Design a protein around this ligand. Structure first.
Ligand SMILES: CC1=CC(=O)NS(=O)(=O)O1
Ligand SMILES: CC1=CC(=O)NS(=O)(=O)O1
Ligand SMILES: CC1=CC(=O)NS(=O)(=O)O1
Ligand SMILES: [Zn+2]
Length: 257
C-alpha cells in the first residue's frame, strides 16, 4: 500500500497508479515570473458561513476535517470556476522540519505545510462521480509558514492527541474554516490532479499567494501524529507531501498583477 516511505513513497506510486506520470499532475512549482496575470479571472467566492463540520479523522496519510456536503452549505465559486463546488473536507501536508512540507512550491520555495480545502462540482452530484471529470474538483491550497500562531487553527491542534494513529476519528462539530484563511484571496490557478493516489486529473487548483502563519507549537503537534495504527511500530506522520511534478503543457494563471 502506498505511503511516504522509502519503499512506498511518491517515486513508487506510478506502479499502482500510472497516471502519476500523466499530463496534468500535481503539485507543481509556481514560477511567479512566468505565471501570466489573467484580467478575465474573477475574484474567488468563498462562502463558508453555513459550513457544518462533522468529524476529524487520521486517515493514515494526513488528518482531515470532514463537512456535510449534502447541501450547498460551504461552497466555492467564481475565480476560474464554472458552477458551484461544495466543501467536503480539508487536510494538511507538512514536514519533519519547517523548511519543507508544502506540496506546491513558489519559485522553488517550500513552505512548512500546506492546507487543502477539497471541493467538488455539484453538477456531478457526488464526489465519486466528480473525480472522474476534468473539472470535477476544486482544491483551495493555502501555504503555512511558522511564526505567529493562527488562533483559528488551535481547536484543530488541540484534538490531535485523540486521533494519534491511523483510523481514529473524533467529533469535530462547529468548526469554522474561515479561521484558516489569509487576508488576501489573490491566487494562482492551473489544471492538475489529486496529490495522493488515485492521482486523478480532476482538479482545478487555486493556490493562494498569501500564506497563513502558524506557531511552532501548532506545527509541532502535527508532527506528533502517527502513520501507523494503534499498537504498531510508531512512525511519525511527517513529510506527507508529494514533490513538484512536471508542468508539461500547462500555464499557471495569476489573479493579481
Ligand atoms: C515513513 C513512512 C511513510 C508511510 O507512509 N508509512 S510508514 O509508516 O511505512 O513509514
Ligand atoms: C498527534 C498528537 C498530538 C498531541 O498534542 N499529543 S499526542 O502526542 O498524544 O498526539
Ligand atoms: C482528496 C485529496 C487528496 C490530497 O492529499 N490532496 S488533494 O488536495 O489533492 O485532495
Ligand atoms: Zn492534499
Amino acid at each position: 500500500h502506498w505511503g511516504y516511505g522509502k519503499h512506498n513513497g511518491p517515486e513508487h506510486w506510478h506502479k499502482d497508479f500510472p497516471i502519476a506520470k500523466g499530463e496534468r499532475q500535481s503539485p507543481v512549482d509556481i514560477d511567479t515570473h512566468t505565471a501570466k496575470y489573467d484580467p478575465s479571472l474573477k475574484p474567488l467566492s468563498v462562502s463558508y458561513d453555513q459550513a457544518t463540520s462533522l468529524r476529524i479523522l487520521n486517515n493514515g496519510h494526513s488528518f482531515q476535517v470532514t463537512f456535510d456536503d449534502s447541501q450547498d452549505k460551504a461552497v466555492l465559486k467564481g475565480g476560474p470556476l464554472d458552477g458551484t463546488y461544495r466543501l467536503l473536507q480539508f487536510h494538511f501536508h507538512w514536514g519533519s522540519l519547517d523548511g519543507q512540507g508544502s506540496e506546491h512550491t513558489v519559485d522553488k520555495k517550500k513552505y512548512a505545510a500546506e492546507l487543502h480545502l477539497v471541493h467538488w462540482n455539484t453538477k456531478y452530484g457526488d464526489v465519486g462521480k466528480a473525480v472522474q471529470q476534468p473539472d470535477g474538483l476544486a482544491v483551495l491550497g493555502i501555504f503555512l509558514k511558522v511564526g505567529s500562531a493562527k488562533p483559528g487553527l488551535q481547536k484543530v491542534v488541540d484534538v490531535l492527541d485523540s486521533i494519534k494513529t491511523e483510523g481514529k476519528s473524533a467529533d469535530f462539530t462547529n468548526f469554522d474554516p474561515r479561521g484558516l484563511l489569509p487576508e488576501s484571496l489573490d491566487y494562482w490557478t492551473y489544471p492538475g490532479s489529486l496529490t495522493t493516489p488515485p492521482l486523478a486529473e480532476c482538479v482545478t487548483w487555486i493556490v493562494l499567494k498569501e500564506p497563513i502563519s502558524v506557531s511552532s507549537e501548532q506545527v509541532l503537534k502535527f508532527r506528533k501524529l502517527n502513520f501507523n495504527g494503534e499498537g504498531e511500530p510508531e512512525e511519525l506522520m511527517v513529510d506527507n507531501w508529494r514533490p513538484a511534478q512536471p508542468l508539461k503543457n500547462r500555464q499557471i494563471k495569476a489573479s493579481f498583477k
